[PDB]
């Protein structure tokens, strides 16, 4: 492995210079232990003040041992592209995700590129200058590591792919996605065969999905024994909202029931034409939308709404009102949960589904205050990748409509 | 003298060294430069160079009113030199330090001139002493050490000092050594005598590496005046704050005023700066005269009352808990204290941001807790326990009904008025027996004239005219009109997502007086249910007010 792959940056672009976030003494101590052991193994080296670049680092759990997570989002944005995503991965019955990031530590990094991987272990209260390192090997989380390792990975996987032609294997960053239509026991047996095959070739691998059940959630309308004026107003508002997506929805017979100036709590019987119109509108919402198609050149956008009682709705789209996917996520309370934990888990699940379906992470619009998310997002983060995110400040007046 | 390793330095890619020509100087300044440069040449800091060095940087000599100082203008070279790892910009906060039994300040004499400069870079530091009236060529010099005023000197000096300190610090784990600019701060819990012995050892080590320290007993004794701070053996405070007294105030005067008040708020509890920054809201020329608002006058007067009494803070003890308390200061302003012992504050602070046109007390309290959390992680590396003037029912109801995710720490309720509370709560279901007001408002987008009206299920209808308004403001005005003409219980139906969104957020304070009046009305009500219908859909009730307000 003496020959290092020469890596470049995009033309007219300098290395990353991102602020290191303050951390608690616990996470700082964990990073000091981890980076000391990594330094003894030659994986990282200390650097001098002639290196102006920086990349943030964090400590997570993923087990009781602390793990180091590097936020290479900026470096990934600035790194050259390297010379595919199978559409059948989402059709498979079972998909298992394996962490193969340790393998990256077997390959040295281009000596002229190492300065761009610089990172800083911060001190408390700015008492001492941070401890600065750069990477000597391919680091986990950098988009160039799977690309440089791609040939070795293909070489190691070639026999297993030969034995099993109908098993789909897609690699995203440090993760291998292995999908099959076998029975669950056969599937897990094949996963363990692949694991042992990787292990006996020096690829350490220290979470299984079912995309066969994923779908775009249909708009649901209430069923009531007695309807009030307020209930019919809600129904007409929701059907009017859904008329932007589905063309055939009608509200004339339903709104006719409210003609006049009535008290909100007055009970209104469902006439025959309004009930048949509501039933027809229920049948219209059973079909999927007509002309929504994925554009690989455009960004993926994910919106999340807090529904209460541990429920969170989400939509993945590229253009407004053109939802590529919709979903609802739930979590059993157990008195050990909170809003940040549920939102973090939701973001990770949505990102996983996005990787399986389209092969890239979406841009998140998070209903949370910026500093709160920046403070607590690492407490429940278990993935090795980090998506882009922004923070909405307007309440969704549509929470009830996606509810 | 090169026992210290040099840092490799490169120019920015595609740039050559500076060739700024030397300005002509008076004969006396030339003499001073000659003597100073001969002394530096004897010491090895600079070297005479041949004629083939194409680079030059202006040199100057001055004496601020006895001693002469040479100054070099490295602006061009600095523009042409690579970036470095940013030297420490944030200074530590005094409340984060641990109390030490013995403490010492060591000023490093001629810090930059003691560290060698990268060889291949020295040619770019060339400068010229001008001859008298340009009769003969001036004297060419170049630096062998870190020049004063060069871009790379602070970072490279700091790095070199760290590497120099590593062995001594390894052989003395019981000694705390901080570095800041050309200063070292050494602390220990040893006996004062053997502490002085350790200080002398450090001085001899640094001297072996070429760094001089206060040769005699060190000139600096407590209290230490440093970066606007007074550092005492058992306490810390800020240096005395002096607020000016003027008849007229410019933008610059108000900026410096709120700067000094911000600086005082870290130890003086109760400081308010909101109305003065509201004076800075215009953000125009620094010399423009700004008239003081009555609220700004009262605010500045209360600040003067607070700064009349001396205050001090204590140092940190890692074995004791970290505790934070928040108190409401009035209209959207909050103050907090961070302490470990009941009356010995580590520090204080404030929070007065609205971050929005409308908000409520619980939201602002949560944001203040967020700010305290970030500051506590920065200063002490941990989050504190919170003592807050809010009850679990109030906060739980809020964060449960809040559309946005929030993180609530562990906290105990402290009953100290004013308590944070929900001044009103909208109904979640329509109210039986209450009158149903269908409301609407409209405005001509050219003439700015408008009207707000309602039609109720009891048969009551009303229209009020409005001047110089917009459609959104007429929607809010229609809701307000319904509140004014209704009983203690009322259902309200509107077609405005704007007004619906404002009211559903349930604010108790606002920048617009109309929303404040709506808030007062809501507080005076018993039950209020607000519903929304799509406009121009002929729902019924909404269509009557739409046709009424359009006519
Ligand atoms: C915010 C940073 C800060 O204030 N840094 C500093 C620290 C320091 O001393 C310590 C050195 C090592 C460990 C703890 C120290 O102080 C603990 C508290 N303390 C402070 C004073 C005192 O007399 N006794 C006492 O226990 C000294 C002497 C400083 C002197 C100057 C000047 N000029 C500027 C900053 C100093």
Curated annotation (Swiss-Prot), chain A:
Effect of residue 207 to A: Complete loss of RNA-dependent DNA polymerase activity. Complete loss of RNA 5'-end and 3'-end cleavages
Outcome, altering residue 376 to F: No effect on RT p66/p51 heterodimerization
Outcome of swapping residue 210 to A: Complete loss of RNA-dependent DNA polymerase activity. Complete loss of RNA 5'-end and 3'-end cleavages
Effect of residue 173 to V: 58% loss of polymerase activity. No loss of RNase H activity
Outcome, altering residue 173 to I: 54% loss of polymerase activity according to PubMed:9533880; increases polymerase activity according to PubMed:9657675. No loss of RNase H activity
Effect of residue 145 to T: Complete loss of polymerase activity. No loss of RNase H activity
Known outcome of mutating residue 174 to N: Strongly decreased RNA-directed and DNA-directed DNA polymerase activities. No effect on RNase H activity
Effect in UniProt of substituting residue 278 to S: 59% loss of polymerase activity. 8% loss of RNase H activity
Impact reported for residue 178 to I: 25% increase of DNA-directed DNA polymerase activity. No loss of RNA-directed DNA polymerase activity
Reported impact of residue 142 to F: 10% loss of DNA-directed DNA polymerase activity. 22% loss of RNA-directed DNA polymerase activity
Consequence recorded when altering residue 62 to Q: Strong decrease in RT binding affinity for all dNTP substrates and in catalytic efficiency. 100-fold decreased sensitivity to ddNTP inhibitors
Result for mutant: residue 380 to L: No effect on RT p66/p51 heterodimerization
Effect of residue 237 to A: Complete loss of polymerase activity. 25% loss of RNase H activity
Mutation effect (residue 385 to L): No effect on RT p66/p51 heterodimerization
Sequence motif Tryptophan repeat motif, location on chain: 373-389
Effect listed in the UniProt record for changing residue 175 to E: Drastically reduced incorporation of phosphorothioate nucleotide. Loss of pyrophosphorolysis (reverse of the polymerase reaction). No effect on RNase H activity
Name listed for the protein in its UniProt record: p51 RT
Species in which this protein is naturally found: Human immunodeficiency virus type 1 group M subtype B (isolate BH10) (HIV-1)
Lineage: Viruses, Riboviria, Pararnavirae, Artverviricota, Revtraviricetes
């Amino acid at each position: 492995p003496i020959e290092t792959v020469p890596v470049k940056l995009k033309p007219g672009m300098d290395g990353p210079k991102v602020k290191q976030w303050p951390l608690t003494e616990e996470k700082i101590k964990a990073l000091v232990e981890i980076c000391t052991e990594m330094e003894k193994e030659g994986k990282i080296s200390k650097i001098g003040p002639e290196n102006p670049y920086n990349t943030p680092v964090f400590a997570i759990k993923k087990s009781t041992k602390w793990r180091k997570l590097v936020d290479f989002r900026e470096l990934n944005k600035r790194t050259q592209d390297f010379w595919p995503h199978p559409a059948g991965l989402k059709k498979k019955k079972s998909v298992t995700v394996l962490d193969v990031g340790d393998a990256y530590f077997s390959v040295p990094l281009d000596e002229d590129f190492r300065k761009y991987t610089a990172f800083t272990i911060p001190s408390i209260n700015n008492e001492t200058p941070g401890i600065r390192y750069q990477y000597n090997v391919l680091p986990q989380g950098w988009k160039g590591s799977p690309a440089i390792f791609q040939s070795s990975m293909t070489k190691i996987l070639e026999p297993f792919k030969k034995q099993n032609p109908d098993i789909v294997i897609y690699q995203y960053m440090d993760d291998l996605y292995v999908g099959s239509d076998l029975e669950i026991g056969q599937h897990r047996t094949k996963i363990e065969e692949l694991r042992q095959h990787l292990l006996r070739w020096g690829l350490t691998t220290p979470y299984e999905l079912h995309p066969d059940k994923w779908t775009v959630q249909p708009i649901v309308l209430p069923e009531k024994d007695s309807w009030t004026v307020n209930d019919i107003q809600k129904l007409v508002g929701k059907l009017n909202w859904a008329s932007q997506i589905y063309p055939g929805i009608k509200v004339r017979q339903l709104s006719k029931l409210l003609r006049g100036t009535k008290a909100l709590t007055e009970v209104i019987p469902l006439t025959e034409e309004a009930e048949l119109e509501l039933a027809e509108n229920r049948e219209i919402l059973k079909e999927p939308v007509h002309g929504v198609y994925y554009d690989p050149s455009k960004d993926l956008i994910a919106e999340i709404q807090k529904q209460g009682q541990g429920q969170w709705t989400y939509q993945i789209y590229q253009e407004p009102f053109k939802n590529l996917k919709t979903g609802k996520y739930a979590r059993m309370r157990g008195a050990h949960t909170n809003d940040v934990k549920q939102l973090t888990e939701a973001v990770q699940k949505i990102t996983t589904e996005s990787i399986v379906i389209w092969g890239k992470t979406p841009k998140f619009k998070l209903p949370i205050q910026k500093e709160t998310w920046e403070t607590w997002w690492t407490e429940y983060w278990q993935a090795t990748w980090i998506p882009e995110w922004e923070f909405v400040n307007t309440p969704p007046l549509v929470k009830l409509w996606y509810q | 003298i090169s026992p210290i390793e040099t840092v490799p330095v490169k120019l920015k890619p595609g740039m050559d060294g500076p060739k700024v020509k030397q300005w002509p100087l008076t004969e006396e300044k030339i003499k001073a430069l000659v003597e100073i440069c001969t002394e530096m040449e004897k010491e090895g800091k600079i070297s005479k160079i041949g004629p083939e060095n194409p680079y030059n940087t202006p040199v100057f000599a001055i004496k601020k009113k006895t001693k002469w100082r040479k100054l070099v203008d490295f602006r061009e070279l600095n523009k042409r030199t690579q970036d470095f790892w940013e030297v420490q910009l944030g200074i530590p906060h005094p409340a984060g330090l641990k109390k030490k039994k013995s403490v010492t300040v060591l000023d490093v004499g001629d810090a930059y001139f003691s560290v060698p400069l990268d060889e291949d870079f020295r040619k770019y530091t060339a400068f010229t002493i001008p001859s008298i009236n340009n009769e003969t060529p001036g004297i060419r010099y170049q630096y062998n050490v870190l020049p004063q005023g060069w871009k790379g000197s602070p970072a490279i000096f700091q790095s070199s000092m760290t590497k120099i300190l590593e062995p001594f610090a390894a052989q003395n784990p019981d000694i705390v050594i901080y570095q800041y600019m050309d200063d070292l701060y050494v602390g220990s819990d040893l006996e004062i005598g053997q502490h002085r012995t350790k200080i002398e050892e450090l001085r001899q080590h640094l001297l072996r590496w070429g760094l001089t320290t206060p040769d005699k007993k060190h000139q600096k004794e407590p209290p230490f005046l440093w970066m606007g701070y007074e550092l005492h053996p058992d306490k810390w405070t800020v240096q005395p704050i002096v607020l000016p007294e003027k008849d007229s105030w410019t933008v610059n005067d108000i900026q410096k005023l709120v700067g000094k008040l911000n600086w005082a708020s870290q130890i003086y509890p109760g400081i308010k700066v909101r109305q003065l920054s509201k004076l800075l809201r215009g953000t125009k020329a620094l010399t423009e005269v700004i008239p003081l608002t009555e609220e700004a006058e009262l605010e500045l007067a209360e600040n003067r009352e607070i700064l009349k009494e001396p205050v001090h803070g204590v140092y940190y003890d890692p074995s004791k808990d970290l505790i934070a308390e928040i108190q409401k200061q009035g209209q959207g302003q909050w103050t907090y204290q961070i302490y470990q012992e009941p009356f010995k504050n580590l520090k204080t602070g404030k929070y007065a941001r609205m971050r929005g046109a409308h908000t409520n007390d619980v939201k602002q309290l949560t944001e203040a807790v967020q700010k305290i959390t970030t500051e506590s992680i920065v200063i002490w590396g941990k989050t504190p326990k919170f003592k807050l003037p809010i009850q679990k029912e109030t906060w739980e109801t809020w964060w449960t009904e809040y559309w946005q995710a929030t993180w609530i720490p562990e906290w105990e309720f402290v009953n100290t008025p004013p308590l944070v509370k929900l001044w009103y709560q909208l109904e979640k279901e329509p109210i039986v027996g209450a009158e149903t007001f269908y409301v609407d408002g409209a405005a001509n987008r050219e003439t700015k004239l408008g009207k707000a009206g309602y039609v109720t299920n009891k048969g009551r209808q009303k229209v009020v005219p409005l001047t110089n308004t917009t459609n959104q403001k007429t929607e809010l005005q229609a809701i307000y009109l319904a509140l004014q003409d209704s009983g203690l219980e009322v259902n309200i139906v509107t077609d405005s997502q704007y007004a619906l969104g404002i009211i559903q957020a349930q604010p108790d304070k606002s920048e617009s007086e109309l929303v404040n009046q709506i808030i007062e009305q809501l507080i005076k009500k018993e039950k209020v249910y607000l519903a929304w219908v799509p406009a121009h859909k002929g729902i019924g009730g909404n269509e009557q007010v739409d046709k009424l307000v359009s006519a």
